[PDB]
Design a protein around this nucleic acid. Structure first.
Ligand SMILES: [Mg+2]
Ligand SMILES: [Mg+2]
Ligand SMILES: [Mg+2]
Ligand SMILES: [Mg+2]
Ligand SMILES: [Mg+2]
Ligand SMILES: [Mg+2]
Ligand SMILES: [Mg+2]
Ligand SMILES: [Mg+2]
Ligand SMILES: [Mg+2]
Ligand SMILES: [Mg+2]
Ligand SMILES: [Mg+2]
Ligand SMILES: [Mg+2]
Ligand SMILES: [Mg+2]
Ligand SMILES: [Mg+2]
Ligand SMILES: [Mg+2]
Ligand SMILES: [Mg+2]
Ligand SMILES: [Mg+2]
Ligand SMILES: [Mg+2]
Ligand SMILES: [Mg+2]
Ligand SMILES: [Mg+2]
Ligand SMILES: [Mg+2]
Ligand SMILES: [Mg+2]
Ligand SMILES: [Mg+2]
Ligand SMILES: [Mg+2]
Ligand SMILES: [Mg+2]
Ligand SMILES: [Mg+2]
Ligand SMILES: [Mg+2]
Ligand SMILES: [Mg+2]
Ligand SMILES: [Mg+2]
Ligand SMILES: [Mg+2]
Ligand SMILES: [Mg+2]
Ligand SMILES: [Mg+2]
Ligand SMILES: [Mg+2]
Ligand SMILES: [Mg+2]
Ligand SMILES: [Mg+2]
Ligand SMILES: [Mg+2]
Ligand SMILES: [Mg+2]
Ligand SMILES: [Mg+2]
Ligand SMILES: [Mg+2]
Ligand SMILES: [Mg+2]
Ligand SMILES: [Mg+2]
Ligand SMILES: [Mg+2]
Ligand SMILES: [Mg+2]
Ligand SMILES: [Mg+2]
Ligand SMILES: [Mg+2]
Ligand SMILES: [Mg+2]
Ligand SMILES: [Mg+2]
Ligand SMILES: [Mg+2]
Ligand SMILES: [Mg+2]
Ligand SMILES: [Mg+2]
Ligand SMILES: [Mg+2]
Ligand SMILES: [Mg+2]
Ligand SMILES: [Mg+2]
Ligand SMILES: [Mg+2]
Ligand SMILES: [Mg+2]
Ligand SMILES: [Mg+2]
Lengths: 151, 129, 144
RNA sequence: CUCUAACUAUAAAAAUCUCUCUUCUC
RNA sequence: GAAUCUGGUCAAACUUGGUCAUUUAGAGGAACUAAAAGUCGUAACAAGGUUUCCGUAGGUGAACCUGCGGAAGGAUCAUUA
RNA sequence: GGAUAGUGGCCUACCAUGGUUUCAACGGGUAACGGGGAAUAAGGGUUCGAUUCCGGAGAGGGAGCCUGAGAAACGGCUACCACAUCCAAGGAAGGCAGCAGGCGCGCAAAUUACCCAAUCCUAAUUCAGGGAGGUAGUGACAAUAAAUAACGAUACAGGGCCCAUUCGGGUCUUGUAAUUGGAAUGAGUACAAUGUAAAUACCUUAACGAGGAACAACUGGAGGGCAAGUCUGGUGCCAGCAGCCGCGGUAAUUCCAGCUCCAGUAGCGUAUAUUAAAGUUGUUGCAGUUAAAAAGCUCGUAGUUGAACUUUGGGUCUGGUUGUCCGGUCCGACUUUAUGUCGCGCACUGGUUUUCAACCGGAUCUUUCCUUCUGGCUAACCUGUACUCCUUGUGGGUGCAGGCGAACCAGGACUUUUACUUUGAAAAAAUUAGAGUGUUCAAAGCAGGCGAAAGCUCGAAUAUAUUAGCAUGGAAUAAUGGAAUAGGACGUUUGGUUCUAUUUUGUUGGUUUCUAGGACCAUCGUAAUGAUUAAUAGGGACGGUCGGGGGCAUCAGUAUUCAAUUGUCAGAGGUGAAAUUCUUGGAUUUAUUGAAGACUAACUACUGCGAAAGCAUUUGCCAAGGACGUUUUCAUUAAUCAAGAACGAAAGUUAGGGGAUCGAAGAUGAUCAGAUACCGUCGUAGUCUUAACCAUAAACUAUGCCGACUAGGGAUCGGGUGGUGUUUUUCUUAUGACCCACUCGGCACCUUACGAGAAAUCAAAGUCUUUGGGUUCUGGGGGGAGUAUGGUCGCAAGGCUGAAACUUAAAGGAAUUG
């Protein structure tokens, strides 16, 4: 209930079921599930949408329960993991959108403050991904170069 | 952010004792809480607790019998030389005839009297009486 | 819990916080600034001699109606001029003008005592002899 | 054991004040 | 092998300005205290007789007045009358 | 390279451009020599340390140097500067922060003394020398012990009394009296002798040495704090006392005295400084709603802190330490003795498997490793070779090849790294602590004790220093690192490579071998082949929403003020009451309209959104956001934050635009004693905007943020679940709107104390003397003062940072009665 960059105190979340093993009623194959994940990724989908699709249209409760590996881990084993992690990429997308809105109208100060917040979050996440060496140590977020990564 | 989990456990114990209850639900349930409550059981200040597996750090349900009157952590786990044990006992315990400064030694988490018996001392965890 | 940090590696900020807060006291600030040496009539000195310039009496406050018999003395050690108090009943006449007088503190930490305004120093000795010995006629002024 | 109705509507002016304070122990 | 003497070298110190620091006077100016039996008002404490106070700006013997935003430390915790 | 005794930018030559810093560098201050230590003392600490010991530096300030092993020496020289001395005016000679002593300075500190006796030191060396040093002189710096009377016999008395005829003997004692006696003794003098280098002085001691034992004890105080007077006289808000409160104005328990008493006592009083008191520096251990004090809010580097999880169990054997039950040993009641006896329930020493119970270990079995080998050395018997000393008996052996290495060496080999903690070596003596010891006791000192007096002796103990370093045992707590591209771990694998070189073929030079020794490289197999959870922590995706969040652009509303047309006709504004002002050029009102600018009534609430300011007509576009739902995704990415940044009401400042209302200044008309104030009418700047500044508000919830828990009651907003629910109507249903129940989150609210507060009060201001979840900022009596100065920002206004001198005994908070 922290809400790092605001006063929110919510706890809306999801409770992972106690049983780690596969659900009794699931009949699909782990190999088929991995093939489905691979195909969805090749369609150009981030792991979160892959999990959503496997939960809605199919009986996949979650990949780790069925296969034993996580969705991003499964993609990385096959070499489809994006160069920029998905959450950081979405943060840059939001930041570039707000910067576009700003440069199209100057007087909006609230969106200026929100851009400051988004850039701070981007810096934090980039620092984390840099200390784990997911990103190169020279990787940085710059306002002028963000569009190329987004585009 | 939950920094010292043992602090939360002992605070919950104190609140659930002052109000007179006979049970507490401690949420995070680390090793150190288990050892602390085990020492309290060995000396009787607590009743019959229980670990509830969550696959998620677990939880603990503690049964009391009103025999306890105060737990409490010394939040900065000060390095306590074997000479300073008596100093802490004087500053914390209400009388020399009872009370126990629960402290963590290289030989495990032990009450201060047991640590003085082993002639070993380490950092201080908390106090019970 | 409290305003101060409590971690095992927070000695630095605790020490500097105490060091910055110590200036709030008056005794510590006086001792470290060393204002006694620079500003006070005596630099950390319990007593000091001086020369009587003139011979004044100063009225008291509201609740106390009288005129306390003082004396203006220019200090010899540095040249400052301060008013001082001739303590006892018939001691004003004992101290004559332009004689060496040894002033002492007034007992209230360099602040005006009682109902006497703008004075901070007693008179203990005059012309080498003490006022208490003169007041009980144990010794007499040398008159030099 | 069932229930939301009645009501108004006054502002002129007016400053200042020399003492003195006193013990509770069967 | 003395005086003397060539070039250095360590360099005290002198002259000349420059600079800073501490003392040091100094016409005059603006103050603050204490002393409360001076003078002109009576701002505040009650609805202080214009409710009070804050920020800012102007004005004026003086406290203070006014304007614009606040605040109750307000004189209302209250209109389904 | 030079120089150095020698390393070294120590210096030179040529290169490189580097080194320190928010973990405070650099600079400034120190009325700073560092330390061993001193004061203070529940514990934590605060202050001091010029000086008896160890180091360093200096000889007036500076430089330079000879001699030597050692000096940048100064009771050694050279020069300059400062200060000086004799002078026959040519010259010469100076160094007390050595012992004395003097001037000066200042509140502040000693005699031109004796001597090498003692400690030692120097020298050619016993002998000489030593103001080092010791002895004395002065010395109330501090410290120890301690005189100023003690005892009778009498008169004035008081209590336990034999009872109580009033008594009263005083039967039994304890004081008060200039009565009265006999003792004892020093403080002083002083034959001596001891003492000492010689002398003082002390220890001893002749002879003197106490009656008012004048051989005479003071210093402060007698209202409170604070023990002791409302006794006498004097002065009368004077004189003065009083650390603070206060006394003194004609009856002073406070001033000046006399009397009595109190406190300490050869000491006591003052002044400054400092420590405890001070939980008023708060790490232990302070406070921030209003008493001083939460930055206006948010982001954020450093700093501080940071979820849980990786062997827990068991069984045996076995070693010390306990309390066990008693053995032997025996001692207290039995007294000049004991046992038999009464047992303290054994005063010394064991069985301590008597079960017991621990309290520590050690080895062992877990798929349970503790670094392992490589030779020693095989220490030891799983060795079996020759065999059995002895009862036919594995009790017991002489012993040689395999073969037990933690019983130990000495070598290659790899060592995850710490933080932490136990033990030890180290932390000079003096000091502190502390053992022994009749210096006559003590401060002290390290002495002494015991013989028969005929040389025999126990000492000169210990501990602590909490930091840094070294060794050591432990592995909880806290941190880091492995294997994710396998470039991972092992093996008799099987291949190749630079080599390296013992011996070996004499030795030397190479060529290959062989043997053995590291890897670089493939390939071959062994293996359970290798990735902790997904925090009722966080980020992110998605879903339908929700909102007076924000920007731009449009839309409307009546109102206000003007304007046009029209209508009549003396008044209309305004006020407590009036006046100023507009009006028959027809104002005020009356109808249509038109222009401008502002603003968004009623709906509007103990309701919503936002980081805080703040946000309220409609519609579209732009992006953003909280909350909820989620068997979605990453896996500590987090909390608070010095430095840095973004917004920041109103007012104000530059310009451009507008210009309705209202209105700082101003103009007046009133009220008044005055009124350039409040009431009134006009009225610029401003209010409204586009750019650029400003950064302050009672920027308030006067309550920092994150996290956990603690108590009952309803409602309200947003979301989501269920109802065999109700109206809805589109025949039924799906929505929607309600109703009931639950849950998450938010602004809130009522009751209560069983908690907290000085209370008012708070469901947080609780979980705080039973004091420690993380973290930032601020306050240390009031005033001076948020002033001056110095920075820094600003065009300016002013913002941020921000004292002292001095003054003061209160200022202040909440509540109670008037
Ligand atoms: Mg020359
Ligand atoms: Mg007047
Ligand atoms: Mg007034
Ligand atoms: Mg008023
Ligand atoms: Mg009025
Ligand atoms: Mg008035
Ligand atoms: Mg020092
Ligand atoms: Mg000095
Ligand atoms: Mg010293
Ligand atoms: Mg000095
Ligand atoms: Mg020395
Ligand atoms: Mg020297
Ligand atoms: Mg000198
Ligand atoms: Mg020599
Ligand atoms: Mg020299
Ligand atoms: Mg000399
Ligand atoms: Mg010398
Ligand atoms: Mg010489
Ligand atoms: Mg001298
Ligand atoms: Mg000497
Ligand atoms: Mg002296
Ligand atoms: Mg003397
Ligand atoms: Mg005497
Ligand atoms: Mg006296
Ligand atoms: Mg007196
Ligand atoms: Mg008296
Ligand atoms: Mg008394
Ligand atoms: Mg009298
Ligand atoms: Mg305080
Ligand atoms: Mg106030
Ligand atoms: Mg305040
Ligand atoms: Mg605040
Ligand atoms: Mg940081
Ligand atoms: Mg942890
Ligand atoms: Mg020592
Ligand atoms: Mg001692
Ligand atoms: Mg080879
Ligand atoms: Mg989670
Ligand atoms: Mg809805
Ligand atoms: Mg107008
Ligand atoms: Mg008309
Ligand atoms: Mg509206
Ligand atoms: Mg609303
Ligand atoms: Mg800041
Ligand atoms: Mg404005
Ligand atoms: Mg303009
Ligand atoms: Mg006016
Ligand atoms: Mg007027
Ligand atoms: Mg007006
Ligand atoms: Mg107007
Ligand atoms: Mg402010
Ligand atoms: Mg504030
Ligand atoms: Mg103050
Ligand atoms: Mg102030
Ligand atoms: Mg300035
Ligand atoms: Mg009050």
């Amino acid at each position: 209930m922290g809400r790092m960059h605001s006063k929110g105190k919510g706890m809306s979340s999801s409770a992972i079921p106690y049983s780690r093993n596969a659900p009794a009623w699931f009949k699909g194959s782990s190999d088929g599930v991995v093939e489905q994940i691979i195909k969805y990724a090749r369609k150009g989908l981030t792991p979160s949408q892959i999990g959503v699709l496997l939960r809605d249209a199919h009986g996949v409760t979650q990949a780790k329960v069925i296969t034993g590996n996580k969705i991003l881990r499964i993609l990385k084993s096959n070499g489809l993991a994006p160069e920029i992690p998905e959450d950081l990429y979405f943060l840059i997308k939001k930041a570039v959108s707000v910067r576009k809105h700003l440069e199209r109208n100057r007087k909006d100060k609230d969106a200026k403050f929100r851009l400051i917040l988004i850039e701070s979050r981007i810096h934090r996440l980039a620092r984390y991904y840099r200390t784990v060496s997911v990103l190169p140590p020279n990787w940085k977020y710059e306002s002028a170069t963000a569009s190329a990564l987004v585009n | 952010t939950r920094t010292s989990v043992l602090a939360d456990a002992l605070n919950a114990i104190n609140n659930a004792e002052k109000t007179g209850k006979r049970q507490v639900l401690i949420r995070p349930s680390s090793k150190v809480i288990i050892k602390f409550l085990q020492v309290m059981q060995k000396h009787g200040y607590i009743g019959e607790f229980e670990y509830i597996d969550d696959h998620r750090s677990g939880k603990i349900v503690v049964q009391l019998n009103g025999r306890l009157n105060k737990c409490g952590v010394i939040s900065p786990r000060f390095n306590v030389k074997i000479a300073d044990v008596e100093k802490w006992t004087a500053n914390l315990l209400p009388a020399r005839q009872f009370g126990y400064v629960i402290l963590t030694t290289s030989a495990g988490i032990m009450d201060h009297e047991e640590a003085h018996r082993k002639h070993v001392s380490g950092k201080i965890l908390g106090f019970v009486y | 819990g409290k305003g101060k940090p409590r971690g095992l590696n927070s000695a630095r900020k605790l020490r500097v916080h105490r060091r910055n807060n110590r200036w709030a006291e008056t005794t510590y600030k006086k001792r470290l600034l060393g204002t006694a040496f620079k500003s006070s009539p005596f630099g950390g000195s319990s007593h000091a001699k001086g020369i009587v310039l003139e011979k004044i009496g100063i009225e008291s406050k509201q609740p106390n109606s009288a005129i306390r018999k003082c004396v203006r003395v220019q200090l010899i050690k540095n040249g400052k001029k301060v008013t001082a108090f001739v303590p006892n009943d018939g001691c004003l006449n004992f101290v004559d003008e332009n004689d060496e007088v040894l002033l002492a503190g007034f007992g209230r930490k360099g602040k005006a005592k009682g109902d006497i305004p703008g004075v901070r120093f007693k008179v203990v000795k005059v012309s080498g002899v003490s006022l208490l010995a003169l007041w009980k006629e144990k010794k007499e002024k040398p008159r030099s």
